[PDB]
Design a protein around this ligand. Structure first.
Ligand SMILES: *[C@@H]1O[C@H](CO)[C@@H](O)[C@H](O)[C@H]1NC(C)=O
Ligand SMILES: *[C@@H]1O[C@H](CO)[C@@H](O)[C@H](O)[C@H]1NC(C)=O
Ligand SMILES: *[C@@H]1O[C@H](CO)[C@@H](O)[C@H](O)[C@H]1NC(C)=O
Ligand SMILES: *[C@@H]1O[C@H](CO)[C@@H](O)[C@H](O)[C@H]1NC(C)=O
Ligand SMILES: *[C@@H]1O[C@H](CO)[C@@H](O)[C@H](O)[C@H]1NC(C)=O
Ligand SMILES: *[C@@H]1O[C@H](CO)[C@@H](O)[C@H](O)[C@H]1NC(C)=O
Ligand SMILES: *[C@@H]1O[C@H](CO)[C@@H](O)[C@H](O)[C@H]1NC(C)=O
Ligand SMILES: *[C@@H]1O[C@H](CO)[C@@H](O)[C@H](O)[C@H]1NC(C)=O
Ligand SMILES: *[C@@H]1O[C@H](CO)[C@@H](O)[C@H](O)[C@H]1NC(C)=O
Ligand SMILES: *[C@@H]1O[C@H](CO)[C@@H](O)[C@H](O)[C@H]1NC(C)=O
Ligand SMILES: *[C@@H]1O[C@H](CO)[C@@H](O)[C@H](O)[C@H]1NC(C)=O
Ligand SMILES: *[C@@H]1O[C@H](CO)[C@@H](O)[C@H](O)[C@H]1NC(C)=O
Ligand SMILES: *[C@@H]1O[C@H](CO)[C@@H](O)[C@H](O)[C@H]1NC(C)=O
Ligand SMILES: *[C@@H]1O[C@H](CO)[C@@H](O)[C@H](O)[C@H]1NC(C)=O
Ligand code: NA
Ligand code: NA
Ligand code: NA
Ligand code: NA
Lengths: 564, 564
């Protein structure tokens, strides 16, 4: 029950055939073995003719089979004939296959077609089935030249073609723009060396055969790639094979070229930390299309040093484990399905992280040298890892008494860039306990070092006050007494004290000496002197580091009636 | 503002600490430099004690930090002390990290812990942040033996640990059952040769380190694989690293082990064709779980010869381009996302395709030899490709007349398995046009061969009827006449006819002969005979293949008065 053919003995109306009356001219129907003819370039029998004779170039005539709507594999075959006259093509012969009353589409078969005064078989293996349907259409386009073109036994047959393979139903293909798409055409039949293979589309560039894989004499697989795809490539396509005796075509199959996602606006900033960064992935309003199946966050330091791509599950996302006083650049990457699925990174939020209050105060706080009214200290350097902030300051903090009131000073060392840093404190009182500490400050907090204590070196004292130097005289002895120096600058270890006989009730007064005494007693009983004489005494106090300056005074011994 | 620590000078209540009063006994709080002690195995200072002395094995005591809920990277560190006595462990020391007031979980740190009469630092790098929270818990389990176990300066610090790395937040992992899952732990710190690494879970088997990749002194990536996964593997997991001076732990991250899809019931059969098969993919009611992201149909011939896996887009799906009288087996494959995503093929619909009516009638229908009443014919063999049905029959159909009525016979050749097949028709009439044709039949339709015509060979005729053999006599001559044989079986080419003088009015009658005559005239004028004599005549008709049988008769010449 598999008709649609036509031997053209009956009128072609009978076969379901018709003329596209919106073109230029009509095909003729002829029977030479009822009405014979002298014409040399006309063959015998019953056929449909196009007489291109007297016709200008470009003029075309269309002749349509009825619309077929089959289930089983079938094969259409027909015979054609061309003749001049001159010997030039009277016109081209095209065959189109319009499917589901859609566009005419590109032609699937054609001869150029030079004269041969001989008939020729040609079959078509169209793979378009119920519930879809298709219309075969024969078109002649006139060359301007003066010959004949004929069709003679169209035959629709409910079995596979014999000289052309058949394509198995090809399904739609989705692809991400930029990447290439591939059409895998399964076929059932033999293909040979001469056979031409390609992928045909309506209103889009046809693609060529990429490769062919011959599984057997009975079946093969031809692949076709549409390359560097855009939305302008998206459309309908079908596989093609032309063999010496026919042409096979697949169904149409749609290429959907979808554009990978990119987020419209950058990620909003939720809150800032020292070592973290809560952000808001916007990435809902997007610039491409398709189902987002994966969302990554990508961040890099402004210098470059570090960068990390990391998948994010929620809208609110925390970037933890960052560096404190650091400039960060964050973009969001979206991903749709398939090979080029991810696509570009969105606008970048640029933000920087707070400072952390410092790890700790500096360390190895040593004394280098101590002096009378000054000392030098030192410590181990530290850097970004202790400071946790590119802006900071280091401060030296000392404390002491002299002797009544306290004094509490602070300085600022500039040894930010220093191997074996130092700081020399000055303007101190001797023999005083300086309590030193290094306080490290940044805008968030502070950390003081270990507290060191350094006793300032001793020094030479002041002189014994001259008001204090009081003496008690006797014939033959003098008791000298004094008070400690108003300001000692150390422990008084010794008093050196000299005496000279200066005058007398007169001889030769060779009666001098020096004497010494522990610091803890401020007196000296002068032993065995001359009476009536006056002695000068000069005292000098002393400290571990030697003698201070001299007070001095004179006293004169008693006299008495001589005896006897 | 980063507290949670405890020096244990203040009561531990002050630090946020407490006792899990639903266990066996409580930790003690001690101050040896207010209340001194003779006990040799007790150190100086302010700490929390567990006195395992007098305690049986198994008995445990718990001591909880408060719950921390931080944002910035921090590091917990504490000091511990163990002493016997004997020299055996008075008990184990465990540390747990309970997160979001969930289960206690497995312990993250522990010493066995043999005596050393010395303190020991230990830090923890816990990566669980606001809005989540966690509780550190110190547990001692008594060994049965008689020693002391102590904790002395817990310190929460708002900076990274110094001797342990930190894990970056690990996200949840989905995996298909059967395949393995992988936990990629990003870390920030240094890891060394001695460090122990693993993946810890609550209520599931822990997995071991698969590999470690050291990007720098500052950061590395440790991978952990859960192998041959089932739903019994699905749960919460976190990364672990133990270093000589501490332990770092990631957040928990969920393993979701989903089961690949399999369809519950087979594909329903929609309609059957010769070269096709509309089916209904049920594959909606399914046996696994997850979003079906791809559906394939798979079919194979019952023999095996061909099988094809092909993606299907709709519920209703047509399998085209099949072989006719062929048993087919069809199962549906479903696919969910990820590495082991497809999973098994469903129940199989088993069905077979109809027959196609045959391609054509057989060919090269030749004559081999023709005979009088029989002939032999032959043709080219064909097979499944012409028959399109494993059940069929070939039939020989002939037609002829003899001579009045028609005869129309049909036979059935059994040369199903034959190189150069033959069939000898019999019981035919000679010199008759037999019109032969081979009709090939199967249950769907038929196709007759080309119609051949064979003229059956000639044969010897019948005799001339003896009623017809009439003669007219004269003195000296006889005119013999007859009719053609009632049934000639060919064209009569000759009549042979003999005559003998048999008697007379009496000598020596040597007066015989034979004569011949074209078939198209049935008479003979016998030339110059004797009068009064009687002649016997015997006629024999002839055909291309020779003489048929004889009719025969006698006539006698006239007499007359003699003259003169
Ligand atoms: C084609 O048209 C020309 C008129 O220009 C006519 O002479 C010729 O016979 C036609 N050929 C046909 C219809 O056979
Ligand atoms: C082809 O098969 C379809 C689906 O069963 C059926 O409806 C149709 O009538 C069949 N034959 C024709 C008319 O193409
Ligand atoms: C067939 O037509 C195409 C254009 O549709 C042309 O490229 C090709 O040369 C033609 N082939 C022939 C006539 O063999
Ligand atoms: C980080 O801190 C340390 C001090 O412990 C310093 O030696 C180093 O230069 C800093 N940077 C690194 C990790 O190289
Ligand atoms: C030192 O400089 C830091 C800036 O990094 C500032 O925070 C701090 O207050 C300064 N010290 C003082 C109190 O002068
Ligand atoms: C300095 O420190 C020492 C040691 O603490 C102490 O004995 C002494 O009294 C302090 N003052 C002076 C003036 O040395
Ligand atoms: C003072 O101290 C010294 C000890 O260095 C002792 O010899 C002497 O007796 C003391 N004298 C006084 C005045 O206390
Ligand atoms: C531990 O308990 C025992 C009692 O069996 C006691 O003698 C010992 O002093 C305790 N140790 C402590 C609390 O220091
Ligand atoms: C940590 O950050 C969160 C989110 O901004 C904030 O609500 C919380 O108060 C912060 N600090 C604390 C109390 O952990
Ligand atoms: C720590 O505890 C685990 C069990 O949780 C045990 O396998 C391991 O030996 C212990 N390690 C020590 C005490 O170093
Ligand atoms: C198919 O049919 C042909 C007849 O054209 C026959 O030669 C062959 O044995 C059959 N099977 C195949 C394709 O091998
Ligand atoms: C021959 O056998 C086929 C079975 O394949 C059957 O369809 C056909 O009708 C038979 N021929 C007749 C009419 O006896
Ligand atoms: C047989 O066929 C031939 C050729 O068609 C014909 O001329 C003849 O009359 C037919 N009949 C006999 C009896 O030969
Ligand atoms: C019969 O036919 C032959 C030709 O073969 C011719 O010689 C003869 O004259 C014919 N005679 C009759 C009786 O028609
Ligand atoms: Na015809
Ligand atoms: Na037209
Ligand atoms: Na303490
Ligand atoms: Na308890």
């Amino acid at each position: 029950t598999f008709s649609g053919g036509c031997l053209f003995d009956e009128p072609y109306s009978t076969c379901g055939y018709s003329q596209s009356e919106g073109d230029d001219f009509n095909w003729e129907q002829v029977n030479t073995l009822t009405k014979p003819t002298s014409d040399p370039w006309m063959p015998s029998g019953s056929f449909m003719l196009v007489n291109a004779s007297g016709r200008p170039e470009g003029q075309r005539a269309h002749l349509l089979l009825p619309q077929l709507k089959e289930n089983d594999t079938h094969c259409i075959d027909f015979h054609y004939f061309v003749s001049s006259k001159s010997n030039s093509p009277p016109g081209l012969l095209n065959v189109y296959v319009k499917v589901n009353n859609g566009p005419l589409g590109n032609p699937i078969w054609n001869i150029s077609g030079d004269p041969t005064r001989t008939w020729n078989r040609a079959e078509l293996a169209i793979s378009t089935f119920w519930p879809n349907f298709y219309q075969v259409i024969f078109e002649v386009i006139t060359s301007g030249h003066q010959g004949y073109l004929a069709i003679d036994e169209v035959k629709v047959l409910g079995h596979p073609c014999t000289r052309t393979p058949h394509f198995l139903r090809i399904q739609n293909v989705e692809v991400n723009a930029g990447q290439f798409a591939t059409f895998q055409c399964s076929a059932i039949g033999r293909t040979v060396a001469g056979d031409r293979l390609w992928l045909q589309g309506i209103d889009v560039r046809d693609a060529p055969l990429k490769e062919i894989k011959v599984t057997s004499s009975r079946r093969f697989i031809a692949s076709f790639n549409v390359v560097n795809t855009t939305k302008r490539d998206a459309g309908k396509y079908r596989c093609m094979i032309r063999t010496e005796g026919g042409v096979g075509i697949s169904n149409y199959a749609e290429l959907v070229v979808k554009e990978p996602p990119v987020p419209i606006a950058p990620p909003q900033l939720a809150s800032v930390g020292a070592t973290y960064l809560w952000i808001q992935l916007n990435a809902n309003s997007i610039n491409g299309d398709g189902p987002i199946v994966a969302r990554e966050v990508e961040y890099c330091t402004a210098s470059g040093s570090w960068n990390d791509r990391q998948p994010v599950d929620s809208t609110s996302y925390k970037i933890g484990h960052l560096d404190p006083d650091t400039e960060y650049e964050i973009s969001v990457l979206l991903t749709r399905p398939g090979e080029g699925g991810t696509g570009s990174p969105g606008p970048a939020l640029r933000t920087r992280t707070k400072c952390a209050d410092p790890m700790r105060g500096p360390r190895k706080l040593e004394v280098v040298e101590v002096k009378s009214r000054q000392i030098t200290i030192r410590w181990e350097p530290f850097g970004y890892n202790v400071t946790r902030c590119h802006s900071y300051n280091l401060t030296v903090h000392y404390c002491y008494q002299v002797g009544g009131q306290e004094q509490v000073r602070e300085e600022v060392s500039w040894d930010t860039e220093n191997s074996h840093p130092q700081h020399t404190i000055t303007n101190l009182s001797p023999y005083t306990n300086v309590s030193v500490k290094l306080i490290l400050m940044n805008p968030e907090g502070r950390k003081e070092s270990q507290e060191l204590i350094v006793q300032t070196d001793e020094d030479l004292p002041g002189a014994v006050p001259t008001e204090s130097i009081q003496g008690s005289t006797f014939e033959e002895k003098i008791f000298l007494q004094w008070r400690e120096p108003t300001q000692t600058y150390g422990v008084i270890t010794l008093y050196e004290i000299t005496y000279k006989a200066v005058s007398s009730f007169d001889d030769l007064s060779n009666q001098s000496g020096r004497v010494s005494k522990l610091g803890n007693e401020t007196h000296f009983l002068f032993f065995g002197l001359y009476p009536g004489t006056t002695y000068s005494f000069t005292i000098r106090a002393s400290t571990a580091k030697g003698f201070g300056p001299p007070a001095t005074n004179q006293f004169t011994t008693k006299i008495s009636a001589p005896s006897m």
